[PDB]
Amino acid sequence: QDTLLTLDTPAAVIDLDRMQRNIARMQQRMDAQGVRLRPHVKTSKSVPVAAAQRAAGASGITVSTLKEAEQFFAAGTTDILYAVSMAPHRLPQALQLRRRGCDLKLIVDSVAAAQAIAAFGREQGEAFEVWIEIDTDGHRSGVGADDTPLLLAIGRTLHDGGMRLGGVLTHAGSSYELDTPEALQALAERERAGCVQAAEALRAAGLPCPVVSVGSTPTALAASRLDGVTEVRAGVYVFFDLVMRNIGVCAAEDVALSVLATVIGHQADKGWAIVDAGWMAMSRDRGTARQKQDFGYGQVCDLQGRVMPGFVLTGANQEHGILARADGAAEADIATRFPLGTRLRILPNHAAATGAQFPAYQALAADGSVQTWERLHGW
Amino acid sequence: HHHHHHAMSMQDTLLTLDTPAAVIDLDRMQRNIARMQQRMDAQGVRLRPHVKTSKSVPVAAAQRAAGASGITVSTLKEAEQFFAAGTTDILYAVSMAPHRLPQALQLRRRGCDLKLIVDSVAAAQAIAAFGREQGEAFEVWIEIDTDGHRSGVGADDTPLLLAIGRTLHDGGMRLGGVLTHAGSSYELDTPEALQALAERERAGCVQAAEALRAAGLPCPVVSVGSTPTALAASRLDGVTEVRAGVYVFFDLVMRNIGVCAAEDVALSVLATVIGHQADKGWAIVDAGWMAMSRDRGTARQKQDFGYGQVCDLQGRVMPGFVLTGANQEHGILARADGAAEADIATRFPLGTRLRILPNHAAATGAQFPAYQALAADGSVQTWERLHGW
Ligand SMILES: *Cc1c(COP(=O)(O)O)cnc(C)c1O
Numbered sequence A: 001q002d003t004l005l006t007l008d009t010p011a012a013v014i015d016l017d018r019m020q021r022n023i024a025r026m027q028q029r030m031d032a033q034g035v036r037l038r039p040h041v042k043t044s045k046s047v048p049v050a051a052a053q054r055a056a057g058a059s060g061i062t063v064s065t066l067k068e069a070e071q072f073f074a075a076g077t078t079d080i081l082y083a084v085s086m087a088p089h090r091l092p093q094a095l096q097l098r099r100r101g102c103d104l105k106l107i108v109d110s111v112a113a114a115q116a117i118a119a120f121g122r123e124q125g126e127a128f129e130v131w132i133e134i135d136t137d138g139h140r141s142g143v144g145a146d147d148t149p150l151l152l153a154i155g156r157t158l159h160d161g162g163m164r165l166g167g168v169l170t171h172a173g174s175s176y177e178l179d180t181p182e183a184l185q186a187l188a189e190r191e192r193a194g195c196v197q198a199a200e201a202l203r204a205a206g207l208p209c210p211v212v213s214v215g216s217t218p219t220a221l222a223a224s225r226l227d228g229v230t231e232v233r234a235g236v237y238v239f240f241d242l243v244m245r246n247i248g249v250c251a252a253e254d255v256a257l258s259v260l261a262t263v264i265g266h267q268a269d270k271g272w273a274i275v276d277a278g279w280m281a282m283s284r285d286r287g288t289a290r291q292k293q294d295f296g297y298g299q300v301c302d303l304q305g306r307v308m309p310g311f312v313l314t315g316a317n318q319e320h321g322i323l324a325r326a327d328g329a330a331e332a333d334i335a336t337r338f339p340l341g342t343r344l345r346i347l348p349n350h351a352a353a354t355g356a357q358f359p360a361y362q363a364l365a366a367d368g369s370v371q372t373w374e375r376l377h378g379w
Numbered sequence B: 001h002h003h004h005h006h007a008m009s010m011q012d013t014l015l016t017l018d019t020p021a022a023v024i025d026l027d028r029m030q031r032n033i034a035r036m037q038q039r040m041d042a043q044g045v046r047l048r049p050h051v052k053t054s055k056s057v058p059v060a061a062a063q064r065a066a067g068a069s070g071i072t073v074s075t076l077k078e079a080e081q082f083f084a085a086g087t088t089d090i091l092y093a094v095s096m097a098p099h100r101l102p103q104a105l106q107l108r109r110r111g112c113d114l115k116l117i118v119d120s121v122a123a124a125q126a127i128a129a130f131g132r133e134q135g136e137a138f139e140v141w142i143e144i145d146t147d148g149h150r151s152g153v154g155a156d157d158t159p160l161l162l163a164i165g166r167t168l169h170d171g172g173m174r175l176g177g178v179l180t181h182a183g184s185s186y187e188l189d190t191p192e193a194l195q196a197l198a199e200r201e202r203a204g205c206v207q208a209a210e211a212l213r214a215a216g217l218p219c220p221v222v223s224v225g226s227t228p229t230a231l232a233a234s235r236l237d238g239v240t241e242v243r244a245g246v247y248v249f250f251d252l253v254m255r256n257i258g259v260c261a262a263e264d265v266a267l268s269v270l271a272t273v274i275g276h277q278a279d280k281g282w283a284i285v286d287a288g289w290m291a292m293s294r295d296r297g298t299a300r301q302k303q304d305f306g307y308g309q310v311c312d313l314q315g316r317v318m319p320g321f322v323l324t325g326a327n328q329e330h331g332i333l334a335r336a337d338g339a340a341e342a343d344i345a346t347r348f349p350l351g352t353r354l355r356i357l358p359n360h361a362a363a364t365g366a367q368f369p370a371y372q373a374l375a376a377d378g379s380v381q382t383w384e385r386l387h388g389w
């Protein structure tokens, strides 16, 4: 039996009970709202994590790279949305996946990218399914929600060009800057309204738009109503993290991903315990620094997963993390509290960034045993 | 010529690779390798490169061919990979955890001349007890704290030096030396401050070695270094070797510290423009923080490069454009000075390929399974690197 006492450190540990609670909470909310859940696997890139999301009721997946679409298709998942503005040079890759039987959907937000897809699709005999990305909050990519002329020009380029105009999507990722239920509820409504308005504008122009897809984890969990929406995309919620805790959509005790670390030394005068989880284990993500509670490079928990308020990783080098008091004081006799060899678990600022540092997760069962769940690295 | 014809037809260049990709400019890397080795040769000290920046066999092979002596690793997985590749002289330069002793023993039993470090009496007792139990005289160095950065015994803490040194020597282990790493050098940016810190690091490590020797304890190696202090030390009297790693590529944090120029940076991320927000002057690229890493070490330095400095396809800097924001798989390219470029779509057309210089070469490299090693002829070769532990 591998267990938390036998693993080498650092290790990325998924508490499966916490993961299952998070999976149930999101699926039950999307059912309450009358929409499908299309989880975004870029958080975990792991076949068994996505399998648990599908078993609870999810419908298809969202991926952030074509490498994830290859991985998940090779595992039997065919309903795949690649939710990053399509690069024309990746069209041969996308064509090969569709010819193989993957129902791979692409997105675009410009006439030039829509023309490149439709021209290549006609040449190769492929009616690509393409969704139009809508910018509903100024966060990133997308056609402005009131830019009707651009929306229609892209829609007619796809539809008149022989492609399948499959829907519109938006991602209100500016939700990550918010931290009150009122602000999140309001942004969720702006995301819903803007995505529904773009669908209605396509329809009113006689163009097909069967899918309306919205979501980020915080807006998924905050939306009061989702009229007009057919699916919500969310991914980080499967594990949560401290940035999500600060946004206010979970508690620290809901975070299912932690990094198992061993105490390898101390600086007694400074009240530091040095652990073997540095920034190569945690990642350089410091999202909580700009939030109302800064957790440094992570929140310390004991080996049982009990949060230890007031101890965080105040600093990190590549393979060394510095555990110390959040209150700035030099904990007296730090080595007496955390002897050499003590194992601790660190909750991450950002679950997708920390998970991508590891070749695999250690999925922790109720009996204390672990099973290794590989995940994807690279492109 | 069957092999020849098939090989050509399969050769990648910067035009055919998928993006993002981590590209090493081999000519720049070789200048970096030569420069550090020449400096250590001129000081009469060994260079023991730290492979944690690249974790790539052919990069360490270039360092060894240039004259390096052994390597430094940050994990036992690195020691396993490089020993399998034929590197026998390996220093594991992270405070040794007792639970890793069986793996260290197996590596030594297979022929790896693996050196461990400690900075505590309890760690030295654990190594000596296991070495007695297993019939192994481990070689252990004592880590010295010469600048307040991280691990190590204070250079002037004689009683703790001797306690640890005697625990190892009386315990039947080989007390092989002292080492220090003056990582506070990353907060400096003037040659005055760097030269003075390099002198503090040399003086403190040598002080500890002299105190052990004055107690009758062996201490034949004195090992110092960070890339900034390796490049700044005036003198290395009393030092046997210098360890440096990031110099093999450099990055924008090193450029800001002042120990290289942006044109010495050998690692860049190849990216494609996939979109725009013309009214905000944004080009959107397919290198987000998953490609660049979340490192923002330049944010506190004299020039903030956001998530990386934009260069053209030929690798030349495009002044004033940086990645100002990054999400997982999207980077936001825009003016450093916060003006909205007019006509951003004509400046950076959809499908244009760019190269992004990183804040931190070790952090960006770790995001990739492999580097694309770019030769003078524009040909690339895939150079695998290690991920995980
Ligand atoms: C990552 C992502 C999501 C899921 O949002 P999270 O807040 O990461 O759960 C949805 N849509 C798109 C386009 C994304 O990139």
Ligand SMILES: *Cc1c(COP(=O)(O)O)cnc(C)c1O
Residues within 6 Å of the ligand: B050, B052, B072, B074, B093, B180, B181, B225, B226, B227, B228, B243, B244, B245, B246, B247
């Ligand atoms: C990384 C490291 C080095 C090399 O320093 P760079 O500034 O990273 O070149 C040397 N010694 C130790 C102990 C290190 O961790």
